[PDB]
Design a binder for this molecule. Structure first.
Ligand SMILES: CC1(C)S[C@@H]2C(NC(=O)[C@H](N)c3ccccc3)C(=O)N2[C@H]1C(=O)O
Ligand SMILES: CC1(C)S[C@@H]2C(NC(=O)[C@H](N)c3ccccc3)C(=O)N2[C@H]1C(=O)O
Lengths: 617, 617, 218
């Protein structure tokens, strides 16, 4: 029979060898790199055509290396095939490497969520540190087009693997750039913020741990997660209905609600500081990092306190989580001066890496910190940062006290007073307007810059503000909440927001008129007031002292603006509700545990609530 | 060691026992259904919880059955889990079945693009007809929750499987509804339109035939496919560079550019009419179906001509390809009276199926055709349709003649004349505004309703129009292009557009003022003027007679509007360029073959070019 | 299904709601015009209009009621059907035998925004469709009390004038009482995801308490 007319076989070719591969400006190599224990990791190596003695940029990920190196699947150019954040390195003729971490996608082995370093939580012979070590060693001995020099980078979990590598790096690892890294999931990164549980973790658990490869989110009943979580009750109740009780990582998390040995043995900022790395580091996070706000700044500061003898620079731009690898010209309704993300990548990131990865390159002398000013709209270069803080700094912090008539003053109010608000767990304050589902990435990403006017309009939120500013107030450093608060219950969460109120009218951009822009906010779970590792019941109606750091600022409250402070006791559904009655484990709270409570914030006198502001000249 | 602290194993559970399955209102059964030759087909059966004596709605697809039955992956309700087009059947308590056709995704066997029916092109013991027969037989003997009655539906390729089943159906198949079915890929469906090749097929080939499962599109050099295809030259040159020469189906298509035995043996409209089927049929296609305009109407008409002894109704709504399964409220800038798609599904589709699938249900008496009026904005029920055509109809067609001064008249112009335009293959007319890539689904879907003013402004397009209408002109049926055209070359394509010019000003919706809306347009490859199977060279400068049907219409050209006709010789990059020089195979046209030509359209006299309009009272 | 003066524009939508075609043009063309032609253009066809022509915001069609309404408090074919507030913040057609009460604190320093902040009366685009806005923001507040039926197994048809029969107490000596009748959309609306659980008010109003006994004498 004529094959050009009659097909009795298959129309699917046995093997494909398309000439589009010869039309590429790069070469893609797939290799199973063996670790010291025999476990092989899937590694993608993207080499520019005619590359000779080129440096290597490495990233280790739980997010499918094959896909990460395929922004535009099988693209004709390296620029399209690699992520937007790799732009400056593609332009620099770097060799790009993406590797699936142990137990994920193309890699063999067992997967352990944020696998702990060797120690009491990991008694085996391998960890993310040795895996990175073995990887770098293989690369410098099996990539002839390379110069044997490796640089490491990555954001979030991809930043976590960089930090792990820094614990004991291979001699060929010449430079590192952890971006929004997961450093302490309990203190202020992905899982908790000062012990307050982040409910978006459930979808992440099922999505990343259902299979070696891809997984799905938890099927929902309602389009609104405010509804879904409130109806389920406690976080543990939602997890149980989702089937998470059979997931080993959730089993461990549920067993360790407090900051005990399980979480302390995973605090990478403290562990890295003990090791005192000698590899040049560039730490980065967004000023509005909605997923890993604790990581970079705390790791960088710990290293500074440990007196590291290696380049250790902190970079913070006007970005959301991982925004550094995309376009940084805007965030929500905010507009910045140009693509700040590309600016950093091109003017700082790239030259810094070139110095150690490309022999003969110009030397860069980076300061302590490079931070974008969200007030002046420009990049600030700080030789020594911060210049103001609570201890061991040139100057101290400047308290902005809460006052009578819901005001704020830099003068300590002698008059004693208190403002009350009722916190009702049956009607928790939406962290962003309803309806909201964790699946709505477009709403989640810029949530930290949203207008706080909705919250202000509620009786379960207390708001304070200065008079309209006649002179600008410059802040640069870490604000500290010095809170004196009472609750009629035996437990409570305390949400503190530092806000920049835009001019009453903004005629050049009308929508921004009176807009309440939060520059720094966080939540503190009251039971941990005395000890993060040992939760304790609060005394009903007792004015108690809470003292905790808030996200860093580098802002200028300009003329016409106001400084504002908002305090509330819920932030739903991002954070699970504090039942306001002391229970052993808030994950297991029952319907009858949730108690309406009256909260009282004291102002003036010996218990003068204030925000310790890093005011500078 | 403590397992709740120390994990030396994997965080990925061996298997998941999700309790969310008990909250579902449906169950899913996955079965490998064996065909008569031993080959097993992956079949997904979606049964409403506690269903009994329920009818079955079956669809056979090359687009992943598992995914088709997972609109919202693992949803809690059957309504979410199934496609939007299944809404009325979910409400009716139907059992939904999606099956992977032989050789695709979860199914075994060899895959053959639009596998031809048993005959000269398929000498084996199986085909899509027997596969459907074996499937229905298994379903009625292995699904206890069913009443033994099966209904078949599906759009495009999923409609093609319905037609194939109708060739020799199982006695349990009580009713069928082919939607925009692939019936004749050469005459006017997916691959060609009157011999003019559709270049979007290349991406489809690589996406559907690279592997049993999912594939990818062809990597592009430029963002604009106008640029990509023009730079490549001929369609065969693009296919070669894409690596399609190793794909068996392309090898067969390339060897059969003309309507020979290979395509004639695949014309389902002619084959089905010869089989004398007795299964009630409901044929559907969009009035603006940009992918399968030929299929439904031609199959329905052939059966009507063969005096089919079964219900045979044609339905055409104001939809784009497969629009019947979504929301039919709008299309491009057009707005219709409500969700026309849901209206049809609820008022016609569902009750028709219920009559034969749910014993005891009310009987429906559908007319010849149910067509939406794109002028009156209402559903028309035509007992006998069409009422006007070339032969064997109640009335004849009404010619709208091209006239002097670029006008259009219902009066046969006595004066002989001609208008000329230069067709340059180096500057082909964009079918839609540049830039355009076949990957841009949002621009491709509603392309048939786009404003034709851009084309009008070009010197390589001739435009004719009536005076502003003082009285409405109603049309219902199939328009026929009666073209008398000459070319200075030895080959040429002829694009003819029937347009409704909106009122000069539309104050209630300003953007529509003077908008040139095409209600019916198509292309004809000149070499097939005398015979579709035997291409012939055209005589240079000879006025030749072209006679071909255009897409059906059911419209009213209202007062203030104009009727317009546009003629051109290219439609890029949707259709490959006619070199305008007769070559044996246009697929393999060489750079030197492409020739600039002068086109002349004659009007009036014995060669009075016109559009034979189906004008009705 | 229109906002104020919506009859003179396009009636295909209102906020996020979508109706069956341009309902405003439908009325203007099929009812308004022929009715006027009968008395203004001698020789025109006579039209026999019913008591009321009302669009059904549930069935998405025009209803022609010869006699409307068919149910009301006095002098109608039938009476009204009470939908009682119940324990557990529920709603029931069955009169609850036991006495109960739910409380909420009304603070004038933090009044409930009728629509999301910020809002200026100059923003006509936000003002026009305000009556169809989602009431989920209000529900989330402690100064708002919310009641709901279980998910409906059977449709409930309503046509006429609803009446608020309120038994309320305040610790003050005056108070406003806002009552909203809402249709909660299905938990999930896969064909239009944004509508899932949407709390659409079909009828709401406010009553100034001082006028409880007499509108003329507070
Ligand atoms: C590094 C990223 C590009 S991938 C990661 C991500 N996406 C997901 O987590 C998503 N569920 C996913 C995608 C692919 C495989 C597995 C899971 C996202 O966002 N993060 C980015 C970031 O931090 O910049
Ligand atoms: C029936 C459909 C829902 S799937 C089909 C489609 N999409 C593709 O062809 C696409 N390449 C694809 C998607 C998923 C798996 C494999 C291939 C599209 O559009 N058609 C729809 C229609 O006709 O209604």
């Amino acid at each position: 029979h004529d094959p050009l007319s009659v097909q009795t076989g298959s129309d699917i070719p046995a093997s494909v060898h398309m000439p589009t591969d010869q039309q590429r400006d790069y070469i893609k190599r797939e290799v199973m790199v063996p670790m010291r224990d025999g476990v092989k990791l899937y590694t993608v190596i993207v080499i520019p055509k005619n590359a000779r003695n080129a440096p290597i940029l490495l990233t280790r990920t739980p997010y499918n290396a094959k896909g990460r190196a395929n922004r535009v699947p099988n693209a004709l150019t390296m620029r399209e095939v690699l992520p937007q954040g790799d732009d400056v390195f593609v332009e620099g003729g770097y060799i790009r490497v993406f590797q699936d971490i142990r137990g994920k996608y193309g890699s063999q082995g067992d997967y352990v969520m944020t696998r702990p370093p060797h120690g009491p939580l990991n008694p085996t012979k391998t960890d993310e540190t040795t895996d990175a070590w073995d990887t770098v060693d293989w690369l410098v001995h099996n990539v002839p087009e390379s110069n044997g020099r490796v640089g490491m980078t990555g954001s979030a979990y991809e930043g976590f693997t960089v930090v792990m590598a820094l614990l004991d790096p291979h001699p060929a690892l010449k430079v590192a750039a952890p971006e929004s890294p997961m450093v302490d999931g309990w203190m202020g990164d992905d899982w908790f913020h000062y012990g307050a549980f982040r409910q978006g973790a459930f979808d992440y658990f099922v999505s990343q741990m259902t299979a070696r490869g891809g997984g799905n989110d938890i099927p929902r009943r309602d389009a609104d997660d405010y509804t879904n979580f409130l109806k389920a009750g406690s976080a543990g109740s939602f997890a149980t209905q989702a089937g998470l009780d059979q997931y080993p990582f959730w089993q461990r998390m549920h067993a360790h609600p407090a900051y005990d040995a399980f979480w302390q043995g995973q605090a990478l900022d403290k562990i890295l500081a003990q090791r005192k790395p000698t590899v040049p580091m560039l730490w980065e996070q967004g000023l509005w990092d909605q997923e890993d706000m604790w990581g970079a700044i705390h790791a960088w500061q710990a290293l500074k306190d440990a007196d590291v003898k290696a380049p250790n620079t902190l970079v913070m731009g006007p970005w959301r989580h991982s925004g550094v690898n995309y376009n940084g010209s805007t965030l929500g309704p905010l507009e910045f001066e140009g693509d700040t993300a590309h600016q950093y990548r091109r003017d700082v990131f790239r030259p810094f890496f070139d110095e150690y990865l490309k022999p003969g390159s110009a030397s860069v002398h980076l300061p302590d910190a490079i931070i974008y000013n969200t007030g002046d709209q420009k990049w600030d270069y700080y030789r020594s940062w911060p210049s103001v803080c609570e201890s061991n700094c040139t100057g101290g912090l400047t308290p902005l006290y809460l006052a009578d008539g819901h005001g704020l003053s830099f003068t300590h109010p002698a008059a004693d007073g208190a403002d009350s608000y009722v916190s009702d767990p049956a009607h928790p304050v939406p962290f962003i307007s309803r309806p909201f589902a964790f699946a709505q990435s477009s709403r989640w990403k810029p949530w930290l810059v949203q207008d706080q006017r909705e919250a202000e309009s509620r009786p379960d939120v207390v708001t304070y503000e200065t008079e309209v500013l006649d002179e600008p107030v410059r802040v640069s450093g870490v604000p500290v909440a010095d809170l004196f608060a009472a609750t009629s219950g035996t437990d409570s969460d305390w949400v503190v927001k530092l806000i920049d109120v835009q001019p009453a009218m903004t005629p050049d951009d009308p929508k921004m008129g009176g807009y309440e822009l939060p520059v720094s906010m966080d939540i503190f779970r009251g039971r941990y007031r005395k000890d993060f590792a040992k939760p304790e019941a609060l005394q009903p109606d007792a004015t108690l002292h809470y003292h905790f750091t808030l996200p860093a600022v580098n802002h200028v409250f300009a003329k016409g603006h106001r400084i504002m402070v908002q305090i509330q006791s819920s932030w739903f559904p991002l954070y699970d509700r504090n039942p306001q009655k002391f229970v052993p484990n808030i994950f297991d709270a029952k319907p009858a545990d949730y108690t309406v409570a009256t909260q009282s914030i004291h102002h003036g006198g010996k218990e003068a609530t204030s925000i310790l502001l890093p005011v500078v000249k």
